[PDB]
Structure formats: C-alpha cells, structure tokens
Design an enzyme around this catalytic site. Sequence first.
Site, PDB file in Angstrom:
ATOM      1  N   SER A 103       5.156  63.189  16.101  1.00 54.48           N
ATOM      2  CA  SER A 103       4.180  63.233  14.910  1.00 54.48           C
ATOM      3  C   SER A 103       4.751  64.333  13.812  1.00 54.48           C
ATOM      4  CB  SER A 103       2.746  63.445  15.226  1.00 54.48           C
ATOM      5  OG  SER A 103       2.344  62.237  16.002  1.00 54.48           O
TER       6      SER A 103
ATOM      7  N   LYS B 140       4.954  62.589  10.418  1.00 54.06           N
ATOM      8  CA  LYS B 140       4.089  62.154   9.603  1.00 54.06           C
ATOM      9  C   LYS B 140       4.117  62.916   8.330  1.00 54.06           C
ATOM     10  CE  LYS B 140       0.896  60.699  13.264  1.00 54.06           C
ATOM     11  NZ  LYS B 140       0.628  60.964  14.732  1.00 54.06           N
TER      12      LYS B 140
ATOM     13  N   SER C 148      -3.685  63.655  13.107  1.00 51.90           N
ATOM     14  CA  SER C 148      -2.573  63.099  13.768  1.00 51.90           C
ATOM     15  C   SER C 148      -2.926  61.564  14.062  1.00 51.90           C
ATOM     16  CB  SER C 148      -2.004  64.080  14.887  1.00 51.90           C
ATOM     17  OG  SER C 148      -0.805  63.764  15.003  1.00 51.90           O
TER      18      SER C 148
ATOM     19  N   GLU D  26       4.448  53.812  15.050  1.00 50.10           N
ATOM     20  CA  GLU D  26       3.542  54.408  16.227  1.00 50.10           C
ATOM     21  C   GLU D  26       2.998  53.331  16.897  1.00 50.10           C
ATOM     22  OE1 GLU D  26       3.485  58.648  14.762  1.00 50.10           O
ATOM     23  OE2 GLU D  26       3.290  57.356  16.627  1.00 50.10           O
TER      24      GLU D  26
ATOM     25  N   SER E  23       3.868  65.484  19.538  1.00 45.89           N
ATOM     26  CA  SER E  23       4.330  65.414  20.898  1.00 45.89           C
ATOM     27  C   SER E  23       4.538  63.996  21.599  1.00 45.89           C
ATOM     28  CB  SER E  23       2.959  66.078  21.823  1.00 45.89           C
ATOM     29  OG  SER E  23       1.783  65.077  21.985  1.00 45.89           O
TER      30      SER E  23
END
Length: 262
Positions: A44, A47, A104, A140, A211
């Site tokens: 992440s 992002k 997130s 994702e 993660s």
Amino acid sequence: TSAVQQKLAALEKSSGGRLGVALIDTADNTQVLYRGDERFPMCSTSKVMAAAAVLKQSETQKQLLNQPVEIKHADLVNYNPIAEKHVNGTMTLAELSAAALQYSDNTAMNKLIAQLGGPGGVTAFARAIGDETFRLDRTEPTLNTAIPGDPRDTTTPRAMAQTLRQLTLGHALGETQRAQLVTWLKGNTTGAASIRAGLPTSWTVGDKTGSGGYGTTNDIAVIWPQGRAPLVLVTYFTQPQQNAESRRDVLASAARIIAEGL
Ligand SMILES: O=C(Nc1cccc(-c2nn[nH]n2)c1)c1cc(C(F)(F)F)cc2[nH]cnc12
Ligand SMILES: O=C(Nc1cccc(-c2nn[nH]n2)c1)c1cc(C(F)(F)F)cc2[nH]cnc12
C-alpha cells in the site's frame, strides 16, 4: 560500511527477513542506504503514487477532485473501511484519495487506478516525474502478494525516497497539490507503530504504511524533526515464509537506528 549500516544489518539478521532502507536528509542531501537498490514489494505504499498521479491530473482538469465516482457492490474488495459506507452511492476523487492514503482503503485505491487508466497509468506518472524504477502492475488486492523474486508492483528504497522527496518537498506537483498530498500524509491514521514509533515524539511525520504476503511490512515517511530540515525515509521489510506475521517493530527499530545516527 558505516556504523549505521552495521546496526541495520544486525537488526536484519535478528529479524530473520530482508530489510531495505533509504534516508534522504534534506539539510545536507546526505543519504543512508541499506539494500537501497534492491526491489521490494511496495504494497500500500504505492497508494502515494496513485494519489499523486490524480493530483497531477487535477492541475489541468480543474474540477477533477470533486467529480463523483460510483461505488458499486462489485467494486468492494478485501479492505474497504470507507468505501463500504458509500456502496450504491458515490465518492469524489478527493474523498477516494483521502480514504486510500489515510485509511489504506483498497477499493478507493482501485478507483484511483481506474481513473488513471489502469496500473500502467500509475507507472506512466512515475516516469513523467523522473522515477524510472517504480512499477505498478496489478490492482488491489493482488498487488500485495509480495512473492520473492517477482518484479511486479515493486520499487527500490532509493527510488521511492527520491520520488517521495520530489512529490512532497520538490516540484513534481504544483504548489497546491503538493500541499494537499502533505496534508493527507500528515493525517494518516495507520502509522503510529511504524517509522513514527522509532522517532522522537516532538517530530512531525506524514507517512503511508503497507503490508502483504510474506510478512511484508512497509512504511514511507516525510519527517520534520524539531528545528531541522525535513527527512525522507523509506523502510521496507519482507520475510521468507508466505504466512509470516507483520513486523512493524522492525520498521520502528530501523527508524530509531537512523535517528540516532543523525
Ligand atoms: O490487501 C492486503 N493487505 C492490506 C490491505 C489493506 C491495507 C493494508 C495495509 N495498509 N497499511 N498496512 N497494511 C494491507 C493483502 C493482500 C494479499 C493478497 F493475497 F495479495 F491479496 C495478501 C496479504 N497478506 C497480508 N495482507 C495482504
Ligand atoms: O488491513 C490490513 N491487512 C489486511 C487486510 C485485508 C486482508 C488481509 C489478508 N489477506 N490475506 N491475508 N491477509 C490483510 C492491515 C494490516 C496491517 C499490519 F499490521 F501491518 F499487518 C496494518 C494495517 N493498517 C491498516 N490496515 C492494516
């Protein structure tokens, strides 16, 4: 190697995994690098690049951040703390950027990716700001698989730190857009156990965690130490076992080693 490099290698050996660190001290442009040119799965932390790419688009599509985007039930993936509240409704690109960065939210990230035309549009923005190393290949949640040796959805610590500097302290973005990205990072909700936990509490931190598979545990941060010019710090960590548990303490320990070496 330097003293700090010995301490980072020892922390890595204790941890059982593979640690990557890149510091830029903007006071004097000095750097600390540990495995700084190895590829790591971004998870992440990617992002940041997607949100920044949409901010860049909004420099010319002036109302873009206020554009409503439909959230359908089929859009919901594996971690949607904000988007799930707006299913069968809409969120703006600003709201999606904030949700991706500060909570997130993986559905929000997928909307940013789609706005950019797919993962390749995020990579194209990275190239446009001078990052030749970053690559986003998947959406994702699969961009987090973090399989050893897989180049997809990776970057190096050195490249990420340079890009984060350009985005938050340099001129990769326009003035208002840079300030907006900084505001979002400073308001992150997920970071207190990661880089921030290894730094003096008086310092101001904006960060983005990540993660994934193989116990991958990441954080990238811009740091304003008390009385000093800002730092940019990338800490990436990944482990040998697919099912390994996260180790945010290793990122905090790496940040503490860096801080004591200043
Ligand atoms: O999506 C995932 N993780 C996630 C989601 C949202 C936010 C964050 C996060 N943000 N800041 N730290 N962690 C992490 C994930 C995905 C996958 C898979 F298989 F690739 F789909 C495997 C994983 N193992 C541990 N996490 C994952
Ligand atoms: O949401 C998270 N992880 C997640 C979400 C969805 C799915 C899976 C997963 N899929 N297959 N294995 N695990 C994992 C998360 C994890 C972590 C941690 F501690 F680093 F592991 C920190 C976070 N801060 C905000 N979100 C997170």
